[PDB]
Amino acid sequence: APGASIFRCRQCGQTISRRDWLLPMGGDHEHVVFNPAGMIFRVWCFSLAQGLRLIGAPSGEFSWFKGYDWTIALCGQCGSHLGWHYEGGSQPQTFFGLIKDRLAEGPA
Numbered sequence: 001a002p003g004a005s006i007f008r009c010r011q012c013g014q015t016i017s018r019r020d021w022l023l024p025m026g027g028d029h030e031h032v033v034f035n036p037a038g039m040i041f042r043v044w045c046f047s048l049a050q051g052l053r054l055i056g057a058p059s060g061e062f063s064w065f066k067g068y069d070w071t072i073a074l075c076g077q078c079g080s081h082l083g084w085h086y087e088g089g090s091q092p093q094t095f096f097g098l099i100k101d102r103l104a105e106g107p108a
């Protein structure tokens, strides 16, 4: 009865991802980054996520991951900012960078 296998939106409970889907980009699933407004994020990389809504068209500006363009990923239920979807790159072509403290971990 594993208690730590699925990630939900911390604000509303929307199903978002799974521990099984964690992706070591450059050899770690966890990347600590800051944006141009100086906000620091603990980003967890996932191969796959669901329950999101991707807004706008991709941008390469200020991308933390070489060769990838990003789109903002909201919770599709509550509209909370959960992270970004990355695309346009290589091996893999796409992935999700989700903000760890915006997710709640728990049983399947």
Ligand SMILES: O=C1CC[C@H](N2C(=O)c3ccccc3C2=O)C(=O)N1
Pocket (backbone or CB within 6 Å): 034, 035, 036, 037, 061, 062, 063, 064, 065, 070, 084
């Ligand atoms: O890889 C990424 C994802 C998007 C992220 N991003 C933000 O967090 C942001 C906030 C305000 C202005 C501009 C940005 C921007 O590029 C960022 O800086 N890099």
Ligand SMILES: [Zn+2]
Pocket (backbone or CB within 6 Å): 009, 010, 011, 012, 013, 014, 075, 076, 077, 078, 079, 080
């Ligand atoms: Zn939500």
